[PDB]
PDB file of C-alpha atoms in Angstrom:
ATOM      1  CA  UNK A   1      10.063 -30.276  46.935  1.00 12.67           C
ATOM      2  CA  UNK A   2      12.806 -29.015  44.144  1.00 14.44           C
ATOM      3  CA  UNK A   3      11.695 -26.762  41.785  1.00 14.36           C
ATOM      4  CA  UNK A   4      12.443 -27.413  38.246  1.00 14.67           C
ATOM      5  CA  UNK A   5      10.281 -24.945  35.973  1.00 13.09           C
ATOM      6  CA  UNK A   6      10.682 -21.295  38.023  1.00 12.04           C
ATOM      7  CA  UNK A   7       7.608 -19.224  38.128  1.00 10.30           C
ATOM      8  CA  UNK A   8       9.328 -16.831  36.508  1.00 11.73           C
ATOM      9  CA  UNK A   9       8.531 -17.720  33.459  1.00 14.64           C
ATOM     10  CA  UNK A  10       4.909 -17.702  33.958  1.00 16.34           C
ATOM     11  CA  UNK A  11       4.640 -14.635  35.421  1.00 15.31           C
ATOM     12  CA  UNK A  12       5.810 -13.347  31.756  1.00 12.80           C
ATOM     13  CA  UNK A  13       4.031 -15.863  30.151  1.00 13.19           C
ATOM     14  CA  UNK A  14       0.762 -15.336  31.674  1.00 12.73           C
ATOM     15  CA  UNK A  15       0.741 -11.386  30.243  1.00 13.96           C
ATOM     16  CA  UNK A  16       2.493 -11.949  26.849  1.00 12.38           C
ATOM     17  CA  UNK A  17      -0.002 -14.907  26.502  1.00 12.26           C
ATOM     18  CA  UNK A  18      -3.730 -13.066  27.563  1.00 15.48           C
ATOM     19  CA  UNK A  19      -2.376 -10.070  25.948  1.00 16.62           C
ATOM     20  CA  UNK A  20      -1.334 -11.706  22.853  1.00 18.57           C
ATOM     21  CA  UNK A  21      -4.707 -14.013  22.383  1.00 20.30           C
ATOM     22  CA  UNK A  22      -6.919 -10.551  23.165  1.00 18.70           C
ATOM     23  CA  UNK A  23      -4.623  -8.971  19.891  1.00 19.00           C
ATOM     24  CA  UNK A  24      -5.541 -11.645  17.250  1.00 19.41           C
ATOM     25  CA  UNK A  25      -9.719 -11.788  18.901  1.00 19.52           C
ATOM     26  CA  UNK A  26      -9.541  -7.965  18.462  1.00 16.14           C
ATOM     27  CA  UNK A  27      -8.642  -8.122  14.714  1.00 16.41           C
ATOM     28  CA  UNK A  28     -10.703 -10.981  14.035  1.00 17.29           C
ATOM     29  CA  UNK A  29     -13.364  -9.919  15.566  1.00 18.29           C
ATOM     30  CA  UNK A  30     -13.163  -6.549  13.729  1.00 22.00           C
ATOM     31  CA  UNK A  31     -12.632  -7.819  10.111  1.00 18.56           C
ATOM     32  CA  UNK A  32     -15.539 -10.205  10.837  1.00 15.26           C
ATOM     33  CA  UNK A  33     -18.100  -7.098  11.552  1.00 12.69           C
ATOM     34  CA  UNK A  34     -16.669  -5.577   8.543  1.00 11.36           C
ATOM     35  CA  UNK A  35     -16.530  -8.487   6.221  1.00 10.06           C
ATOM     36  CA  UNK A  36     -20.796  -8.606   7.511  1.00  8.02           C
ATOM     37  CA  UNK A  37     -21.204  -4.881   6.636  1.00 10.09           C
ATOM     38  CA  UNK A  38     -20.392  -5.517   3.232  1.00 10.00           C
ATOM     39  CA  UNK A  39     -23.429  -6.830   2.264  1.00  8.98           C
ATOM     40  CA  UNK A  40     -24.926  -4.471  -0.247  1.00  6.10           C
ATOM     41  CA  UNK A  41     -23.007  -1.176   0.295  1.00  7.01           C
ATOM     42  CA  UNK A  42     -25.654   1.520  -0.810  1.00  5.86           C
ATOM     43  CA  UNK A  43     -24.415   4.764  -2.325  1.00  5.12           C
ATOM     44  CA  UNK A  44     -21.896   5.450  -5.195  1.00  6.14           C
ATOM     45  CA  UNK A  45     -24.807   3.780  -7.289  1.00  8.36           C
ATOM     46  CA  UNK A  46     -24.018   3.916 -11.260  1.00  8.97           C
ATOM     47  CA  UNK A  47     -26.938   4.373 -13.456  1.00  9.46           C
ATOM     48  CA  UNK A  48     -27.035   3.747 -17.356  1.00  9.89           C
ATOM     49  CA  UNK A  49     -26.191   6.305 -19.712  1.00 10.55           C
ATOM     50  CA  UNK A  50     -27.188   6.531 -23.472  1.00  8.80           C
ATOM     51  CA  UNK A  51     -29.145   3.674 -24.523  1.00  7.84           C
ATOM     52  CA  UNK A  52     -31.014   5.095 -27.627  1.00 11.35           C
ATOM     53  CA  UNK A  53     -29.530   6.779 -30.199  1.00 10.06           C
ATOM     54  CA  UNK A  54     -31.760  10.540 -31.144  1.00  9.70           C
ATOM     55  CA  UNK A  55     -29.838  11.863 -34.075  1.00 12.74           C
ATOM     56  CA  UNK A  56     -31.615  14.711 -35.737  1.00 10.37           C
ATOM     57  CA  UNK A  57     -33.709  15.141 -39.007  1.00  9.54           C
ATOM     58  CA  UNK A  58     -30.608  16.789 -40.679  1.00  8.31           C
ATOM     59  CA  UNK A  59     -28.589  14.252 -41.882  1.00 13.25           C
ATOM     60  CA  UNK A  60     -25.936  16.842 -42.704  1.00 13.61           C
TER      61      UNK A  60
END
């Protein structure tokens, strides 16, 4: 029968497509494990500092 849509075009299509849907899973996908890791994030922990005064008997 006549062709009307040459294969052509989906011989380009079919890598630009797979290899374009594979590029937005891979940096979903990695943002997603990251965005999990950030649950708590230990380290680089701030503790309190001065919280009662001492002063000394001198008062001069």
């Amino acid at each position: 029968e006549p062709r009307t849509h040459p294969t052509w075009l989906l011989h380009i299509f079919i890598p630009f497509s797979i290899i374009a849907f594979i590029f937005i899973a891979t940096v979903i996908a990695l943002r997603k494990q990251l965005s999990q890791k950030l649950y708590s994030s230990k380290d680089t922990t701030k503790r309190p500092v001065t919280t009662t005064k001492r002063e000394v008997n001198s008062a001069i």
